Structure formats: C-alpha cells, structure tokens
Amino acid sequence: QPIIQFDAESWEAEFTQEIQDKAIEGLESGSVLFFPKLNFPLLTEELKFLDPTWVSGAKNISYDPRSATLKGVEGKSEDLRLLSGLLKRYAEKTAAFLHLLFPFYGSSLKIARTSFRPVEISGRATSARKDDTRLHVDAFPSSPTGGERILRVFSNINPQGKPRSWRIGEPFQNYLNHLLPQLSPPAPGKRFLLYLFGITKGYRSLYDHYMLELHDKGKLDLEYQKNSPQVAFDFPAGSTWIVFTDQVLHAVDKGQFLLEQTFHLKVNALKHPEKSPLKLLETALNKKLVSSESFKL
Numbered sequence: 410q411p412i413i414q415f416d417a418e419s420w421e422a423e424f425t426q427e428i429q430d431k432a433i434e435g436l437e438s439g440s441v442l443f444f445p446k447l448n449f450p451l452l453t454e455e456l457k458f459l460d461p462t463w464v465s466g467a468k469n470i471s472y473d474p475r476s477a478t479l480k481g482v483e484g485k486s487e488d489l490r491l492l493s494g495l496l497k498r499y500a501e502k503t504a505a506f507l508h509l510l511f512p513f514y515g516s517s518l519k520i521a522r523t524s525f526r527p528v529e530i531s532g533r534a535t536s537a538r539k540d541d542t543r544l545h546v547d548a549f550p551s552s553p554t555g556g557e558r559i560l561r562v563f564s565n566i567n568p569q570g571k572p573r574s575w576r577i578g579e580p581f582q583n584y585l586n587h588l589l590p591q592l593s594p595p596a597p598g599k600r601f602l603l604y605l606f607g608i609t610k611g612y613r614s615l616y617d618h619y620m621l622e623l624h625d626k627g628k629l630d631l632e633y634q635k636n637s638p639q640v641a642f643d644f645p646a647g648s649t650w651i652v653f654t655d656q657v658l659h660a661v662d663k664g665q666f667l668l669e670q671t672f673h674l675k676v677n678a679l680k681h682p683e684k685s686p687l688k689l690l691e692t693a694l695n696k697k698l699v700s701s702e703s704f705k706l
C-alpha cells in the first residue's frame with residue numbers, strides 16, 4: 410500500500426486514535442501519508458516569492474527554525490523578513506500537525522531545516538549521484554544522521570494547479586537486498602579524514618556509509634531504475650504528504666513551488682524500531698552500525 414490517503418483538511422485538525430494508529434502504522438511501514446485537501450495558503454504579500462529568481466546560489470532556500478536563520482536567498486531586509494515569516498509559519502504548522510497526528514513520538518520529534526523550492530524540477534540536470542529523477546532513499550554525504558530518521562512533510566503550493574510528479578519504489582528491505590552484493594566497507598581511516606577536514610558535519614557512522622552506498626549505487630543501477638516495482642503519482646496542488654524519506658524509495662519527475670519541512674527522530678522512539686533502515690541494515694550485516702548507540706541490558 411504505497412500511498413495511504415487521509416481526510417484531514419486543517420493543520421489544527423484533531424484526530425481519532427484510529428486515524429492516529431492508521432498513520433503511524435503506515436508511516437513506519439514505508440507508505441506515503443497523503444492529505445489531498447491539506448492546503449498551505451500564502452499571504453498576498455508572499456505571492457511574489459512564487460518566483461525562482463529568489464534562489465541566489467547553488468544551495469536551496471532554507472530556514473532553521475531552531476535558530477530563526479534564513480539562508481540561500483539575498484535581498485532587502487524587509488523581503489528576507491517576509492520570506493523568513495513564510496518558512497517559519499510552515500515550520501510551526503507542520504510541527505503542530507505532527508504532534509496532533511503522532512502522539513506516540515511525543516517530544517522525540519526534533520525539527521530540522523525548512524526549505525522552499527521554487528525551481529521547476531523538469532528543467533534540472535545534475536550528476537547521476539544528485540539526480541533525483543532516480544529512485545533513492547535520502548542520504549546526504551556532508552550530513553550524517555548517526556542512525557536518526559529523516560521525516561519530511563511536503564506541501565505543493567503551485568498557484569497554477571500543477572501537480573508534483575513522484576515515483577514511489579519498492580520496500581526498503583527489497584532495495585537493500587537488491588543492492589547488498591554491491592555494498593563494501595569504507596576504506597580504513599577515510600571517514601576520520603572526512604571529519605578532520607570538515608567535509609562531514611560530525612563523523613560519518615557505518616550506517617551513514619551504507620545508506621550513501623545504497624543511495625549512490627541504486628541510482629547507478631540502470632536496470633533497477635528501469636524495471637524495479639514503482640508507481641507514478643501526481644500530488645495535486647494544495648495537497649500535503651508525509652514520508653520517512655530515508656526508507657521510502659522515491660524520485661521526483663516534475664513540478665514547481667514546494668514547501669518542505671525536515672524532522673529527525675531517534676530510532677528508539679519508533680513504535681516498531683525493527684522496521685527502521687538502521688535495524689534492517691544492522692540485521693543484514695550482523696553488526697552495530699552506529700558507535701554511540703545506547704546499550705540495553
């Protein structure tokens with residue numbers, strides 16, 4: 410069941426326990442939670458930001474809600490104030506919604522960076538590694554997770570009714586199994602040098618090493634990209650969806666104007682930790698893949 414649909418229409422909706430159970434079971438099973446009527450409206454004075462010229466450099470426009478800091482865009486203070494207010498409002502609304510929907514996670518949800526993506530996808534072109542028309546789970550070479558989950562909320566805010574076209578692939582366990590013959594341990598000392606030289610933010614755990622290998626090798630596996638099970642779905646303008654993007658194989662084919670919020674969640678806060686990429690990888694390789702793991706018993 411790759412996509413599970415929900416009726417909630419408001420960022421302040423309250424949920425029955427039955428819907429909460431449907432959401433957490435589906436999320437942790439690697440389904441996309443889809444909210445077709447959950448629109449994120451913009452203020453009239455924000456409509457000018459529906460314009461790709463606001464991206465000033467090679468990075469995405471991003472906002473850190475913890476520090477209230479906006480990056481990746483230049484301009485007058487008043488325009489940066491307005492754009493910060495837009496992304497802050499998305500951080501607030503998505504965080505409130507997740508706390509209404511997932512009480513089981515309690516205060517273990519840790520908000521990370523908000524992003525605004527005004528560039529049309531179908532004109533993009535990058536290296537094969539960075540090409541997100543290729544199915545992948547999320548792993549970022551400069552930003553190891555240490556095993557923590559990457560939970561993302563997406564809202565299509567296209568003002569011309571254009572959908573955002575995704576493809577959703579097969580379960581993580583099958584992807585891992587497909588690529589397992591291709592996995593290899595890191596060269597000794599290499600990750601230590603990446604840390605010492607400032608290439609990585611923190612030390613890249615073995616978990617992060619293997620998630621990057623899965624990400625990169627899966628993108629280079631052209632037969633797998635072509636033939637693996639996958640469904641194409643158009644997320645309509647004015648819809649919202651929620652995904653563990655480190656677990657759900659996904660690719661983005663076209664669309665323009667997206668708000669995105671990243672949260673992190675420790676594995677031991679999950680209802681079924683054994684379903685996490687970390688635990689599936691530790692099982693498949695029979696080893697501890699994050700050295701800072703808490704010790705039980």
Ligand SMILES: CCCCCCCCO[C@@H]1O[C@H](CO)[C@@H](O)[C@H](O)[C@H]1O
Nearest residue numbers: 421505506508509512513514515516
């Ligand atoms: C609409 C404004 C947002 C409301 C914030 C979510 C309210 C949280 O709701 C609470 O979450 C707790 C977990 O931390 C649970 O222990 C409680 O049972 C639950 O009532």
Ligand SMILES: [Cl-]
Nearest residue numbers: 549550551552
């Ligand atoms: Cl990176």
Ligand SMILES: [Cl-]
Nearest residue numbers: 598599600601
């Ligand atoms: Cl090392």
Ligand SMILES: [Cl-]
Nearest residue numbers: 563573661667
């Ligand atoms: Cl996307």
Ligand SMILES: [Co+2]
Nearest residue numbers: 541546547654
């Ligand atoms: Co991705």
